Amino acid sequence: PVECFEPSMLKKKQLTVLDLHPGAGKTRRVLPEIVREAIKTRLRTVILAPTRVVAAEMEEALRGLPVRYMTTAVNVTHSGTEIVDLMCHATFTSRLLQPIRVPNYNLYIMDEAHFTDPSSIAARGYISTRVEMGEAAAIFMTATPPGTRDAFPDSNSPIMDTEVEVPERAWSSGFDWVTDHSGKTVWFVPSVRNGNEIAACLTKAGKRVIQLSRKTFETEFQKTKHQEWDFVVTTDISEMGANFKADRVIDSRRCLKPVILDGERVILAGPMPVTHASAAQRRGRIGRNPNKPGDEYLYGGGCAETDEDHAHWLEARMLLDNIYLQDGLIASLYRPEADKVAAIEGEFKLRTEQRKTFVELMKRGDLPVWLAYQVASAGITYTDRRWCFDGTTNNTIMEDSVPAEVWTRHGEKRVLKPRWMDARVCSDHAALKSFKEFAAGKR
Numbered sequence: 001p002v003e004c005f006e007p008s009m010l011k012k013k014q015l016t017v018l019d020l021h022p023g024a025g026k027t028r029r030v031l032p033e034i035v036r037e038a039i040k041t042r043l044r045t046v047i048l049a050p051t052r053v054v055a056a057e058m059e060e061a062l063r064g065l066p067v068r069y070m071t072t073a074v075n076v077t078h079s080g081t082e083i084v085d086l087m088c089h090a091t092f093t094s095r096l097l098q099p100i101r102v103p104n105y106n107l108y109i110m111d112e113a114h115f116t117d118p119s120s121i122a123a124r125g126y127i128s129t130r131v132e133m134g135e136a137a138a139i140f141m142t143a144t145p146p147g148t149r150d151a152f153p154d155s156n157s158p159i160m161d162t163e164v165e166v167p168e169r170a171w172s173s174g175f176d177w178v179t180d181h182s183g184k185t186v187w188f189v190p191s192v193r194n195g196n197e198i199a200a201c202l203t204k205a206g207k208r209v210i211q212l213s214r215k216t217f218e219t220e221f222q223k224t225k226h227q228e229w230d231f232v233v234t235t236d237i238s239e240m241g242a243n244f245k246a247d248r249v250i251d252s253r254r255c256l257k258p259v260i261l262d263g264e265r266v267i268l269a270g271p272m273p274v275t276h277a278s279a280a281q282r283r284g285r286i287g288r289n290p291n292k293p294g295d296e297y298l299y300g301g302g303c304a305e306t307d308e309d310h311a312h313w314l315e316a317r318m319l320l321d322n323i324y325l326q327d328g329l330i331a332s333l334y335r336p337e338a339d340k341v342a343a344i345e346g347e348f349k350l351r352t353e354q355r356k357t358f359v360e361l362m363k364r365g366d367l368p369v370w371l372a373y374q375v376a377s378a379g380i381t382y383t384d385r386r387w388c389f390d391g392t393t394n395n396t397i398m399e400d401s402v403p404a405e406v407w408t409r410h411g412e413k414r415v416l417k418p419r420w421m422d423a424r425v426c427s428d429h430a431a432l433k434s435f436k437e438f439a440a441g442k443r
Contacts, residue, residue: 001145005033010043010107014137015128017113017145022284023156026141027054027061027111034139035065038107039083045107047086048123050115052218054241055088058111062086093119096126096323097359106136112239113140114277118369121316121337126323129331142239143284144277146336151279151303155287159297166252166300168194168271170201177298179205183247186232186285190254190271192428195233202231212237215430236274238281247292251282251299258311258368258424265395266311266370266422273304313340315369321348322355350376357382364443366434371422378419385409387419388439395421399432409441 001017002009009016020026031047038045049055052073059067059074066081071088085103087095089110095102108127113120124146130136143153152161167175168190179202189195192213199209210223212234224232224244232244236255254271255278261267274282279299286295307313320331330346332338350358360382361372380387385408397404397416404416404426416439418425425435437443 005030005139007037007041009139010034010037010041010137012106012137013131013134015131015140016138017140017142019143019145020141021143021154021156023288027058031058031109031111031141032061032065034109035062035067035084039066039081042083043107044103044105045084045109046092046103046105047084048089048092048108048110049086049241050089050112050117050120051240052088053221054111055086057241057243058086089115089117089123090119093123093126093319093323094359094363097319097355104135108136108138109141110139111141112241114142114144114146114281115239116310116312118312118315118319121312121333122319122323124334124337125316125320126325126331128334129325133325144280146277146334147305148280149276149305151276152283153280155284157287157290157295158293159283159287160294161283161297161299164298164300166250166298167198168252168254170197178202178250179207181248184230184232184245185248185250186234186242186244186246186282187250188238188252188282189233189235190252191256191268192235192430194271195235196428199231199233202233207231209233212242213430214240217242236278236282238278238285242285243288244285246286246295248296249283249286249298251279251297253279253282253299253301253303256427257307257309258370258422259309260311260314260370265420266368266424268423268427269309273302275305275307276303279303308340311368311370313337314343315373317341317343318348318369318373321346322350322358348373348377354379365438366443367438368422368424371420371425374420383441385439385441389414389417391417391419391421393417395419397421397426397432397435399426404432404436406436406440408439 001019003020055071055073068085069076127138131138195211199211202209207230209231210229217237217240253274255274256268257270257272258266259269283297325331354376358372358376361367395417405413408414426432
């Protein structure tokens with residue numbers, strides 16, 4: 001990997017991983033360098049941001065430079081120059097799945113290129129394949145290249161690393177060091193539910209707590225920038241543009257993991273150890289200010305690279321199987337991620353109509369990729385919600401120890417019992433609320 005940009009990297013067949021460390025100016029100094037060169041040489045380019053938060057942050061760094069922002073996160077104006085596009089990872093992949101026309105970009109710049117969202121993994125597969133075919137160049141920007149075993153990379157400022165016992169439940173004693181802290185803390189929890197319990201405990205202790213999840217991030221991250229807080233309790237938002245003014249990170253280093261069981265359902269297993277890259281990214285929230293040496297990283301266990309049981313690898317394959325490159329050719333996953341999934345090439349390729357349903361189930365439907373695939377491949381149309389109720393008895397969804405029920409579109413009260421069970425649609429209150437509305441045909 002490389003830690004500084006050279007115009008050499010923009011030539012076709014070049015894939016460069018710009019690794020570096022949190023706050024070294026990736027988006028602030030290096031990204032405008034690349035974009036300026038791309039515009040000067042009239043190189044058709046797309047910039048890929050992990051989130052809309054990052055996209056807006058990029059706009060600030062790229063002001064003055066002609067960029068077509070293809071996101072609602074940025075106020076766009078006319079136009080003239082058509083060289084560099086900017087959009088989110090998910091938008092990029094979604095559009096490749098849709099009939100709409102995506103430019104054959106000759107340069108791909110992916111920010112936070114370790115992001116393990118299925119759309120991001122798929123995007124890297126597409127991009128790396130295009131580079132290998134000699135049709136483009138690519139720059140992957142990330143502090144943690146896929147496959148890294150370094151949980152403690154360099155930082156702008158000295159970091160105090162300490163392994164401790166980290167609570168994952170409410171506590172009455174034994175963890176004074178948590179609350180005996182006058183600074184600001186970012187706390188990475190194993191799940192939203194766990195975060196709720198920890199937040200309530202901290203609030204009871206008189207702390208101001210903001211909670212974030214992967215699904216509330218885009219709208220609620222801004223609270224961390226605009227209101228007073230002592231703790232940010234969050235799931236892994238490390239690479240979503242999570243820049244905080246903090247002096248401490250508490251890291252359980254554990255995560256719930258969606259796992260496909262017997263190829264018929266998805267459970268949430270664990271919590272299990274996070275990867276070295278994940279731990280490095282979480283730790284990377286601090287040690288950013290050279291005027292403030294001695295930020296603390298307190299972690300609660302070890303790391304592991306055995307994450308092949310995570311569903312996002314196969315879900316990436318499901319996405320990539322439905323992206324067209326050229327006749328009979330299906331893109332491979334990015335090489336460092338290629339060994340993560342056992343699959344038959346093209347086995348998830350859907351015909352035109354089913355692919356449209358697949359896309360709408362993921363977008364408007366807001367269903368997990370695996371679940372959306374089951375429904376779409378079954379030949380079910382988007383608004384046909386009968387599958388939400390005709391599952392087997394062990395697929396019954398529970399709400400407060402009692403079978404969940406919804407008022408269906410057909411004016412009938414039915415037990416929530418999906419034909420395919422994916423634990424991610426009912427992992428927490430917000431998720432279950434969303435799925436019940438889906439089952440009722442409200443979207």
